[PDB]
Design a protein around this ligand. Sequence first.
Ligand SMILES: CCCCCCCCCCCCCCCCCC(=O)OCC(COC(=O)CCCCCCCCCCCCCCCCC)OC(=O)CCCCCCCCCCCCCCCCC
Ligand code: HEA
Ligand code: HEA
Ligand SMILES: CCCCC/C=C\C/C=C\C/C=C\C/C=C\CCCC(=O)O[C@H](COC(=O)CCCCCCCCCCCCCCCCC)COP(=O)(O)OCCN
Ligand SMILES: CCCCCC/C=C\CCCCCCCCCC(=O)O[C@H](COC(=O)CCCCCCCCCCCCCCC)COP(=O)(O)OC[C@@H](O)CO
Ligand SMILES: CCCCCCCCCCO[C@@H]1O[C@H](CO)[C@@H](O[C@H]2O[C@H](CO)[C@@H](O)[C@H](O)[C@H]2O)[C@H](O)[C@H]1O
Ligand SMILES: C[C@H](CCC(=O)O)[C@H]1CC[C@H]2[C@@H]3[C@H](O)C[C@@H]4C[C@H](O)CC[C@]4(C)[C@H]3C[C@H](O)[C@]12C
Ligand SMILES: C[C@H](CCC(=O)O)[C@H]1CC[C@H]2[C@@H]3[C@H](O)C[C@@H]4C[C@H](O)CC[C@]4(C)[C@H]3C[C@H](O)[C@]12C
Ligand code: CUA
Ligand SMILES: [O-][O-]
Ligand SMILES: [Cu+2]
Ligand SMILES: [Mg+2]
Ligand code: NA
Lengths: 144, 58, 84, 46, 49, 105, 227, 73, 43, 514
Amino acid sequence: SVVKSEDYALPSYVDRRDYPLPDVAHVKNLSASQKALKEKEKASWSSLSIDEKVELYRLKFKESFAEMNRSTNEWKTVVGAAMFFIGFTALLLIWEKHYVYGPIPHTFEEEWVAKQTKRMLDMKVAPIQGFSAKWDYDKNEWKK
Amino acid sequence: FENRVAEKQKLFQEDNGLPVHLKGGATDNILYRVTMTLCLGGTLYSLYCLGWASFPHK
Amino acid sequence: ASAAKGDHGGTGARTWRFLTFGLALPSVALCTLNSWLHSGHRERPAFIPYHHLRIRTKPFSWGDGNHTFFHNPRVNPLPTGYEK
Amino acid sequence: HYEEGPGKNIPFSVENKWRLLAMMTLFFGSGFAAPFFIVRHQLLKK
Amino acid sequence: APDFHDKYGNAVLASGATFCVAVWVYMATQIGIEWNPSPVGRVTPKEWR
Amino acid sequence: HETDEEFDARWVTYFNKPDIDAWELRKGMNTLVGYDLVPEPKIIDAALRACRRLNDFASAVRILEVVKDKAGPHKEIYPYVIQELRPTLNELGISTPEELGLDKV
Amino acid sequence: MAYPMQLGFQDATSPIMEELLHFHDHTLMIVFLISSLVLYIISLMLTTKLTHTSTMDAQEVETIWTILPAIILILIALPSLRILYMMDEINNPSLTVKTMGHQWYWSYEYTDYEDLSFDSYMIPTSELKPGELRLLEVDNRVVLPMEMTIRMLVSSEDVLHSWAVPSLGLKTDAIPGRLNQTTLMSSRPGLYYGQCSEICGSNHSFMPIVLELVPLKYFEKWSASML
Amino acid sequence: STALAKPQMRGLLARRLRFHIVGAFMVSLGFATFYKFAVAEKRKKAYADFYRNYDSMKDFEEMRKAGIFQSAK
Amino acid sequence: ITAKPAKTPTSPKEQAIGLSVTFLSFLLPAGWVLYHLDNYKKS
Amino acid sequence: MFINRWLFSTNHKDIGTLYLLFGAWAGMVGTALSLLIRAELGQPGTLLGDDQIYNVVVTAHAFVMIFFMVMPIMIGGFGNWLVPLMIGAPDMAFPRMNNMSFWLLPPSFLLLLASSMVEAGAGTGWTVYPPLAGNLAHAGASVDLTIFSLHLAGVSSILGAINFITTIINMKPPAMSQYQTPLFVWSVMITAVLLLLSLPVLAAGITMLLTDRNLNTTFFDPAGGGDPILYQHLFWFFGHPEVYILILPGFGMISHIVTYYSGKKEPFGYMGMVWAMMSIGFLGFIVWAHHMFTVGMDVDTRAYFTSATMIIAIPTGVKVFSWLATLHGGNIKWSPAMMWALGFIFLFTVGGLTGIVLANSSLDIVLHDTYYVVAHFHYVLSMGAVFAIMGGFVHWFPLFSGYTLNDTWAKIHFAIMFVGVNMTFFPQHFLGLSGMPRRYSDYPDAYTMWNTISSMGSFISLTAVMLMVFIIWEAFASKREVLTVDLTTTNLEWLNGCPPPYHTFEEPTYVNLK
Ligand SMILES: CCCCCCCCCCCCCCCCCC(=O)OCC(COC(=O)CCCCCCCCCCCCCCCCC)OC(=O)CCCCCCCCCCCCCCCCC
Ligand code: HEA
Ligand code: HEA
Ligand SMILES: CCCCC/C=C\C/C=C\C/C=C\C/C=C\CCCC(=O)O[C@H](COC(=O)CCCCCCCCCCCCCCCCC)COP(=O)(O)OCCN
Ligand SMILES: CCCCCC/C=C\CCCCCCCCCC(=O)O[C@H](COC(=O)CCCCCCCCCCCCCCC)COP(=O)(O)OC[C@@H](O)CO
Ligand SMILES: CCCCCCCCCCO[C@@H]1O[C@H](CO)[C@@H](O[C@H]2O[C@H](CO)[C@@H](O)[C@H](O)[C@H]2O)[C@H](O)[C@H]1O
Ligand SMILES: C[C@H](CCC(=O)O)[C@H]1CC[C@H]2[C@@H]3[C@H](O)C[C@@H]4C[C@H](O)CC[C@]4(C)[C@H]3C[C@H](O)[C@]12C
Ligand SMILES: C[C@H](CCC(=O)O)[C@H]1CC[C@H]2[C@@H]3[C@H](O)C[C@@H]4C[C@H](O)CC[C@]4(C)[C@H]3C[C@H](O)[C@]12C
Ligand code: CUA
Ligand SMILES: [O-][O-]
Ligand SMILES: [Cu+2]
Ligand SMILES: [Mg+2]
Ligand code: NA
């Protein structure tokens, strides 16, 4: 029933698939009816009804193996919330770009970059693989 | 000299609840207050000096 | 130094076996690798009949008198130079 | 002797969660803010 | 009995993924960020000398 | 290193001890399920009969549960085990977890 | 120089830089393999309901995971040290050039015959000619003969700097009171760029290196032109 | 139909591990082969091809004509 | 781990408050300094 | 009573709590500095100023993260809280000296603050190399305050090391040998031996820098016959051990976490784990010059240091495979601490492997002083040391506080942080291979895309840090008091409840010999 803080020095109940028979019964204090059932249990189990058998099981254990092993929907909450917060971060980045950053240098302007690109090809920057390798110097175009 | 350790043992085991750094009596409190006042005052002073040194001066 | 290791509590057989297999023999293994890896003959240098080397003031009491005890023909010249 | 148990073994109080939020906000906020204001100080200094 | 994740997990996942993609796409494409992609297959080289 | 046969026999003897107590039943099962095996029917048989001597029906059901659980994805093991145990289940009146509906969330 | 969205090394301009590229490919294969094996094994450990929680004996398996990494390390160290000793080889240069680091620019001295020296400063962004590269150009490039073994001597007249040219595989610290030597051999003409590679104060980011590799006859014309 | 036969009941975890560590080896092998052709040999071929008939004077003259050099107009 | 129910449960509304207050306490001071950077690099 | 308890402490748990508070606050400072770095680099051009203000930020970022966040949290915080409990001891050997190791850190931090406020700050790198750090290129008080900051941090840790070694050798139950103590205890003891031996050398080195700057010595000044490279040897003789100091307590916490959430009573291959930590600690003293492969050393020296550095992969690999073998066969509990530890195993492995790349002196010529190095050490520090810290904090927070966290929130926090650190640092490999130098406030235009992405990653990690503060608040706000935990038979620190009483083990454990 009710676990108390002053009880950490005592054996406790656990539902763990690799500790199938815990140190204590799930239900410690039995009612008059429950004690009766435990007396019946000393006779043949064939004389136990299904409902009574389940009640004996639920005296001893909290969750069954199928119950303790159940999957949950938690991953949906975790993945969606994480995406929410990652989305929130982009708001910060938008704010930074709007109020903090000034213009970037003029070397990123389209005409500068076109000229820069030609000069890099003229000096054959990375001509084996990296860059000029990808320019067709005969056809004067990017290698298709 | 004579061995007066037993009398110091009696003094420092007296059940008066005092922590060891004060158990010698009123002299301990004086020395403690001198020490702590110098430490805390000197620390305040060091902070003042930071503030002074943090801006262009002289 | 404290070296960089750590144990004691008790220096005992178990600790010294730990040191033997965990530090001492691995170090021997490493040095064995390093050595048998830098082997491979060096070029023997030009023979020069320096007077402070290949000393003979009395014949050696074995062989022909003129060969050192662990004479290696490949790398130990005689006073007149490398043999054969 | 000292007080023992959850929320008693700490140099700050958790008796009121909103007082606590203020404390924690001052505590972590002041550490996060200090580098921005030092940078401002150095940029303003000269 | 259904927990928070049974009740709301589907909505959290859908709304979170939607917000995230939309705001990042916007940040990436609509506010003047210079990504400086490769000029290969993009830039026409222009005379500089 | 014992043969499987000697391992199994040790565990059958363990659970067959007539005056085995509750602590020993639990110790035995909780130890056994740490190994990389699903216990042989002859072991489970001895364990269920110890449950009988200890007037503990619920642990009998729990033992059937952990046998199924130890098989992991190997779905053929539990029906074979239940097959081999059905004489004992009948003799002792042990309902399976499934019969008790304890296999459903 | 580097180009936008580059993932790997600048194209090799020297034989030693090509050796490093092949050695890096070899080592990165191993890094990717071990990384991916660890990732896979993590997923393998985490994806079964089967259990085994009693004590496991470790001796046999630890032979394998000490001997196999030992062999892999040897397979990295063998080509690694081959290249190390290759870089160190007697190369007999035909030219020596000195460079001196300063806050914040490089000077160069060609004192084999003529006593030539000059300073090399970054071109400010506001003075770049159209199509020139931000933070990388200099006013006076290190003119050098291609396809020739060159001895570069590096030092500093103030704080530490470091003289680097990635596409030649070069990085030599510039330390006052010390004369460090490296060897430079460009397989190709062209312009090769590098940047100061030891923190040196206010303008550490802004003191680049530019080599200008040209045929010997053109190098000689250039030196002759400095009389 | 009749009696179920005894499935393997011992060492299921070890059997799973062995099968997949061997499988991981096979993939590693395979990947080593892919990488040596898609990356390492590709790079070796690219440099060897570039230089096999490379004309460093012709390359220089092209750069010179394009005006890239300070020292050689 | 097992635990008693919350002595002073924190509702989703309460969490939204604590979260917002926490995030603001990091963002607003830094924001103020960074917003005013240009205003600093001239004084 | 408040002052007696919190300023005059002689209690290992309260002193551990002070260290955790201190290190958390330091972690905010260090995070702010990292965001200033990444704001400067987040687009081309100049945001703040030239390399001076920028590298004052970089320098402070490193000192704060290493000396005021990681070491106080791992060694002062988890070490003080956990080590006496894990050996059943009633406190540390020198409970009063322990309190001085703590109270030296706020003064140390104040000196670091003062260094950045006076003059133009110490824009030297955390390595503080002369002559840049000398009295002509860094005239004025900033570098001297930085040296004094390190002196006080050094004394704090040396005394703490003396305390931990003495406690761990002398205060175990009389039946417990060293080979019956938990791996986290081993990891602290070995870390403490490394601190004891390495910090005095650093102290010697920075004292010589102090006297070069103020008493006209010339240890590092060629004009007097000194040598800047001597400083580098002295610094790195400490600085390589220091990175093993930063990771070893992390290894010890990872061992406990992986064991616990695999449902195991013990880590796989205990004696191999002890061997591996001792081996790493020993090898960590004979490799320092791999920080110096471009300074001009002779080729045989570079070959020795290449080889000796790579062999550390062997014991480290034993630990990685033993963690995997601890997971093997487990009943895995997918707790947030387990997520931190799994992320640790993989990402620490990636960073260790790029360290092995860097160990090759030939390739290090091209990689040295580039962002490849930055990528290497942030995988082992931002995704190794920090993940071990986060895993241990979420695992043991209920022990220290008596309250549970919200596990779903902690899992969200892990997910955000995982994305953020990988987005920040993985592209820095490309920046390094392609030649972007360290300690630059601005970069050639070709480097823009990956710098942009890396700075976006740093903001995601900032969102995680903020969320962590809220999560800790939520736990203290809701007050879910712990009842029981699993596996106390193999996790003694839990067996006095949550939180444990001020005094524990007043009656020591009973352990017999047989
Ligand atoms: C959690 C996500 C957060 C978001 C942030 C990202 C996280 C990282 C995940 C990203 C996961 C990526 C897995 C492999 C990435 C290699 C990319 C590459 O093409 O590499 C190129 C090389 C250099 O290569 C070259 O010299 C030429 C390259 C181009 C070849 C010709 C093709 C031309 C077109 C190029 C197309 C691109 C090819 C890519 C091909 C891609 C194949 C995979 O660079 C390098 O060495 C950089 C790497 C240095 C050391 C890290 C190795 C350890 C990683 C193993 C597990 C991943 C851990 C990630 C850590 C996290 C993983 C879980
Ligand atoms: C926690 C901190 C930490 C840790 C643990 C490490 C661990 C290692 N580090 Fe690193 N390092 C730093 C932090 C760290 N480092 C820092 C901060 C710097 C920069 C200093 C500065 O300049 O500011 C740096 C710099 C640095 C350099 C200098 C580079 C330069 O400046 O040019 C080198 C070179 O050898 C290096 C190597 C290594 C190696 C080989 C390891 C090894 O210990 C890694 C061993 C681990 C593995 C290899 C992974 C696990 C193993 C297996 C799965 C087995 C199979 C593997 C193989 C067979 C290879 N580190
Ligand atoms: C432990 C060490 C550590 C850590 C964690 C970090 C974290 C980060 N670092 Fe840092 N960094 C260094 C140590 C570290 N760094 C060092 C030594 C240098 C070299 C200095 C030099 O060149 O001189 C360096 C350099 C460096 C550079 C290169 C600067 C240059 O060369 O110009 C960059 C650039 O992006 C960078 C960025 C970041 C970022 C974005 C993070 C982020 O990932 C940070 C994100 C936040 C966290 C990881 C949380 C931290 C807080 C806690 C863990 C407390 C949690 C609280 C409780 C448990 C209660 N770092
Ligand atoms: C581990 C491998 C080696 C193990 C040791 C091997 C031999 C040890 C023998 C005794 C050593 C004692 C000293 C003897 C002096 C010389 C032996 C030196 C060791 C040796 O063996 O030297 C060899 C010469 O031996 C020679 O001359 C002649 C060698 C034989 C003659 C010995 C003469 C008697 C010496 C007198 C001893 C007096 C002792 C008095 C002690 C009094 C103490 C109170 C060297 O060979 P090499 O061909 O010249 O060079 C190698 C070329 N490839
Ligand atoms: C640039 C200028 C930098 C200046 C930095 C100065 C910083 C420090 C201010 C130091 C003030 C020191 C005040 C006295 C400290 C005495 C400590 C001591 O003596 O500690 C003792 C333990 O250390 C032991 O023994 C072992 C032996 C005693 C160690 C005492 C060391 C003092 C620290 C000096 C610095 C050392 C650095 C060394 C390496 C370079 C006792 O431990 P307690 O826990 O107290 O009691 C335990 C009780 O059972 C005793 O009855
Ligand atoms: C690297 C870590 C930092 C991450 C980024 C922080 C995320 C943004 C947080 C918001 O910060 C606020 O932004 C306002 C702008 O939105 C500023 O108001 C400023 O701008 C307003 C309008 O332009 C005026 O009304 C105000 O008076 C003026 O102070 C205000 O000072 C600042 O606190
Ligand atoms: C002997 C010692 C302790 C054994 C014990 O008393 O429990 C053990 C612990 C770790 C062992 C080492 C580690 O398992 C790592 C290596 C593994 C190789 O298979 C043998 C050498 C190897 C270096 C081992 C030698 C030796 O067996 C060590 C050092
Ligand atoms: C780096 C250090 C010198 C520091 C100094 O300049 O002050 C020197 C002193 C002794 C040297 C070592 C010793 O000379 C012994 C070895 C000699 C080998 O040729 C290189 C490795 C070798 C292990 C050396 C490495 C390195 O050069 C050492 C360690
Ligand atoms: Cu000159 Cu950096
Ligand atoms: O230092 O690695
Ligand atoms: Cu190192
Ligand atoms: Mg350097
Ligand atoms: Na910038």
